[PDB]
DNA sequence: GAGAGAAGCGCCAAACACA
DNA sequence: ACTGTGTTTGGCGCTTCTCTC
DNA sequence: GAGAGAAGCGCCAAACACA
DNA sequence: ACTGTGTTTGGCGCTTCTCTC
């Protein structure tokens, strides 16, 4: 019996076929097996993409990066415009809510006033001080899923680009002052370098004629939900957990009840399709 | 009526034409501040919706849409000028004016626009009615007119010499007949855009242009408002050929006011730029008289 | 809300009218606020003016290195606790990072801007430097704005006030004559040259194969044109009714079907 | 000047083009810049592939894997035949030269006598005891480049497969004895599971008719050498080192003189093409 | 070297002759070595015989669980320090892991092989178990081989000797009658059935696009046939002169050009 | 000569033919152990090189290669048998014998081999000369002959009934005329391979085969050597149809030796397998006489 | 004289790292 | 709302240009 | 009666982890 | 000699089969 053979040995589809079974029956035996699906690290789920603004100064991404220079650790606060890619970076001695506000205001003076900003839930971004500063300027601030740095991909990539340019500059003049290098790198990135795919600079996109209006949006999502095996983003696990039913699923993540009391948001990269127990 | 994007495509163009004709009705903002508020509001909504529609769809421009769009423009803009008053005042109808300007500007830049269809709907009378609007004291109107005339000149080929002659005539009238004009700063910018695209060798008509209507433009009392643009234009002309710069400096030294005045410094500024170009090629033919005139 | 915008920035009336405020409401806000009651260059980034200003405090002094464009009035200012040639270089570099590379710069004669270090800095970027011995209006505007901000809140870290002031006079206030903002006048793309005896054709955007995000599809659904391009996405009409911003990773450059 | 502009700002090709340069000149400016190439983490070099036997029992790959079970750490010695993929695995209490020899002899009894065997330079494989045991059986033993686990890809992948099956079995019977599970998994892998690409089991390949003789080999390699930027496999580095000239380059690695006294073997994945200084 | 092979394994003469040794040399090695001086089943893995043997040591005892196929004589033995039903199950599982799944197994009546646990183990694998109350030649061969190995080296960990003995009697020694080795007789694929009124066509190998390893190429150089397939590579003739084993990652399944 | 892979492909086939004819020379190993050592060594090298060549190239088999390859086989194998001697001895020419066997086996399995070209070069005389070699006392030769005859029977279609009649004749001669035969174990394996490929309904010729030459094969004194294979064959026959099993057991009970002998147990073994198949389908027609005969 | 090398130029998938 | 992304790089196809029989 | 749903089956690129 | 690899998986194209106007 293919069912008994798989229950004893957990052999694959081609093994079950030769002992007598059609491809569909062996395939259903594999699909209905909980042990196989909890322990196979493979899964096939869609990819998510960060939310991008409809026009300049609509959505921004911010992050803090460490840089080592002259036995001193500098904290670079970086803001990137999700439409044009324009970068504002400031170097500070430490990470603090006051420094976050100062860097945001410097970015506003450099680029403009953004409608929304989103950052990972860092200690200096969830403070009451930062929320009050954003609210006084009518800036709506949202946060990401914890322990998922890929949800801020654009700003992290910009951190890499900025640090690479800084290393290139310091390779020539080890005695070059930090602010000189940062200013030259910012000028190079925004005014000199050309974006790979649109063949235009960041500054050209940022000050392009705003004549094209904002395209309309739609808040309608899928009205159905499924069962999911899952892994918690914070702690990596060898085998999946669940399965459990999703309260609601957005484009890029879902609500999974992790325990009997609290639910949580999990991205599609840590979810695996299950089968309905009924 | 109904939203243009919520109807079948078979009659969508008909609804677009209906909304286009719905903007043909005029509204007076200067007569009284409060009159037909909801009519103005729905007109603003219709203009915004139409311009949002036009720049997100392709293959929507067809022959039965070409003429009356211009008509709508002619209905909204070609009109008698407000009385002169010599900070400048702003037109009370500016909301709808800005909507129609931005709509026309995006319409003229549509990738589906064909330049061979407007040759029977946009003619010299439209050019005159558009150019006469440059006298407006509203800087927004002048900026939009600059960015509109530039594209019209660039796209069309059979209406270039006519615009050049018309701007020569308006320069003559401004410099000789009537001094009252304020759309002079942007016209020189458009001219500089045209001059920069010249080839070699230069045509003698351009020499007539500079020697008749461009250099004499310095003897106007109101040069202070538009000193840089004019200067830019000559720098955009002499760079093509350094041989034809001697008449320029010869006339420039003659238009210099022999008496002390605050206006002198601007002249010096111009000379500096010319100097920064005239030093090479061994140009010392008029260096001595220039120094003699500068010393006094 | 224009009232909060004024109470935080103390900008001009044209700034309020550009927002939801009306002329009479803007005037009311003006007279209800207790605290508020030539172009020698030819092109943007052609000639700059560099000045050093002293900011007076109750028990300390600040040095403001200010660079102003002589075509748009665009202001780039940095605050320092001292003054030397290297700091002048740093301020010039920051001004370049915000505005761009100037062609010529102009300034007074002094210990800074005349040393060999500053000359070396200017020569490496190919900037011609001219010196003279004797605009001050921009300095006055900045001084009044900083004083108003400090009067509103004496407990400011002397950095946010400067950033807000630059934002106000660059992006919010409107130049009276041209009725434009300094930022928009400075960074507005200029009219392209018009070639003679050659029609100015319209640039054609390329064609792409695309995939719908969030579907885990693997077959590219036909080639289409792009309405707009930006950093990280392109506006692709998915159907004849709506359009969507598709990321580059889900796009593949194609050839026109002809 | 494009050369001066790049020397100051290190801008990209499209930036250098607009300041006046042909694509070739800007491309050569970028190629000849040392700072750009030492600091860009990108490189384009060929891929290597482990050496595979010409027939069954020609080359084997071995490795040790840890497994956790009943608060006890078991050491699985795994041997894989590089031609057929046949697996021999034995579970021991510790890793020792004696255990290595015992596992090798068990594998020989299970599968046969191999001509050559290669393993990573583990502590229990480089001992004199193991070399003497291999020499007594006329087994030639070679080792891999240190700190490069990918050079033993087949055996590491087999470790993953074996552990996945073990977890599947223990998911049902937590009280199942270890040797029972290992024997069932070995039977499933060698006799039941089917290889993905050749559509045959490992045992079918291992005992297939040996009628096809060994194809001939060629020891001829490339007679030319180049300059290379490099990174040391043991210690990761942000930026490249060098460049230096290769003493000789084989198919998959090269000799790079790391210091003035000792040279070393570096795989193609940690090398970057340079330009001749003369 | 056959001399070293005998001195380590003490195999038969046919084993030496299969290697470089000659008949007279093999006989000389035989008489120079001081220590050396029916089929009831129908198919392989059809009927097995299970026996338990006691190995005598100077101060301890070993239990050998031995399973022998009744068609090829293939031997699978495990050594234990005790004996019970679970250990019988473990030995059967190891024998299956080396040889395969038998159809029927045969053994004596005793505390093991008759308990409910062993019956449950056999039923889960669908193996029919029959019991009888009374081959012993295989036991004798194994005993002599272990004694010879221990005499050669008294300091053996009692595991390597068993592994070497199994290797010798399975892969090295040659059965006298059929002149084959036990391993080769056991694992030799059998003659496929011959369908009636239908020609036995030759199986056709598929066609692949391939790339040359070590070149960083990106264009697949045409489709070709495969001479041989194995785990991890396929034999592809790169030219009309030589062939190379190309890995699967550099291969792409194709369709015959027709 | 020269290596086959080191010549241009234009004349490579010619060199292959030359090496093929180079193996037509015979060498005697039984006459004296040492004679023409280097000739034998180069013959071994040539055989190994040719077989290594044939299995790594495609489109090398062509019509002018088809006949004489068989000729080479006929030159090396079709010969008088060594005198009978009743451990069995091994042929002294086994090295070259194994090389030529493996060469022919790989040649017959080449994917470029065409079964429609050997119909004019391999005929019934080749079949007889190949089958007569099954009497050899060398087990290696018998194993190779089994694996060769199986493929020849499988590939060809017009030579199947002839082989069946020939094996029936050899069974008759072995069971009645001469008892001296030792190639009986492998022949039954080939038969079982053929039987397993039968269809439904069974032909009456196969019934004649079992009732005439298969069941009587039990009354031979030398059944002990080939007891299992024969048994396998009948299990491969009665599984197709359980109705035709009664004659099998009826004859099986008659061939049972009525006296006590060690040979009895094998008979019982066969019955067990038959029992394991005969219990279903309510087969108790001959259960009582079978039990009566088993009791005695 | 003219078609074959040679330089030029644009495009791209795989790798890489952002705590 | 929740959600990965932008730049570097040897190889390739393709176009333009020059030295040779 | 017959073409449209529906089930069946084989193939595959991207992800994954092997300390 | 030095050198990454084999299995899982939802989606797709393609073939075979059944219920309906
Ligand atoms: C809750 C909570 N508390 N701590 C965490 C947490 O897990 N975050 C770690 C990784 C320290 C972290 N990481 C990054 C980051 O950028 N990672 C580098 C990267 C970027 C992209 C890519 F694809 C892979 C890696 C941040 O920006 C950051 O703020 N944090 C806090 O979650
Ligand atoms: C010298 C020296 N001393 N210690 C090292 C050393 O760097 N080796 C580490 C990683 C502990 C190591 N690792 C693996 C292993 O398999 N890694 C898991 C993996 C496999 C494949 C793949 F692609 C990525 C990761 C081993 O087998 C092993 O023996 N060692 C010693 O080098
Ligand atoms: Mg962060
Ligand atoms: Mg980060
Ligand atoms: Mg290891
Ligand atoms: Mg490992
Ligand atoms: Zn399972
Ligand atoms: Zn105020
Ligand atoms: Zn560089
Ligand atoms: Zn011996």
Numbering used by the authors:
A (entry chain B), D (entry chain E): 3 to 280
B (entry chain C), F (entry chain F): 27 to 112, 124 to 333
C (entry chain A), E (entry chain D): 3 to 39, 52 to 148, 157 to 280
Paper text:
Integration of a DNA copy of the viral genome is an essential step in the replication of all retroviruses. The target of the INSTIs is the IN active site engaged with viral DNA (vDNA) ends in the context of the nucleoprotein complex termed the intasome. As in most transposases, the catalytic site is defined by the Asp-Asp-Glu catalytic triad (D65, D122 and E158 in HTLV and STLV INs), which coordinates two catalytically essential Mg2+ ions. The STLV-1 intasome:INSTI structures showed, as we previously reported, a twofold symmetric IN dimer of dimers with the two B56γ molecules that laterally flank the intasome.
The binding of RAL to the intasome is largely mediated by strong interactions between the three co-planar oxygen atoms of the drug and the Mg2+ cations. Parallel π-π stacking of RAL’s fluorobenzyl ring against the penultimate 3’-cytosine in STLV vDNA and interactions between the oxadiazole and Y149 strengthen the binding. As observed in previously reported intasome:INSTI structures, INSTI binding is accompanied by a flip of the terminal vDNA 3’-adenosine, which vacates a pocket formed between a dC:dG basepair and a 310 helix (IN residues 151–155 in STLV and HTLV-1 INs). The pocket becomes occupied by the fluorobenzyl group of the drug, whereas the displaced adenosine base forms parallel π-π stacking interaction with the heterocyclic backbone of the drug. When compared with the apo form of the STLV-1 intasome, the penultimate vDNA cytosine, which is stacked against the terminal adenine in the apo form, makes a π-π stacking interaction with the halobenzyl ring of RAL; however, the position of the cytidine is very similar in the two structures. Although the STLV-1 structures show that there is a small change in conformation of residue Y149 depending on which INSTI is bound, this difference is owing to the way the oxadiazole ring of RAL and the 3-(dimethylamino)-3-oxopropyl substituent of XZ450 interact with the tyrosine ring. The shift of the tyrosine side chain is much more pronounced when STLV-1 and PFV intasome:RAL structures are compared. We were interested in whether the presence of H146 and S154 in HTLV/STLV, albeit in reciprocal positions, would also cause displacement of the active site water molecule and therefore to some extent affect the binding of RAL. This is clearly not the case as the water molecule is present, coordinated by E158 and D122, and within a reasonable distance (3.2 Å) to S154 to allow hydrogen bonding; the side chain of H146 faces away from the active site.
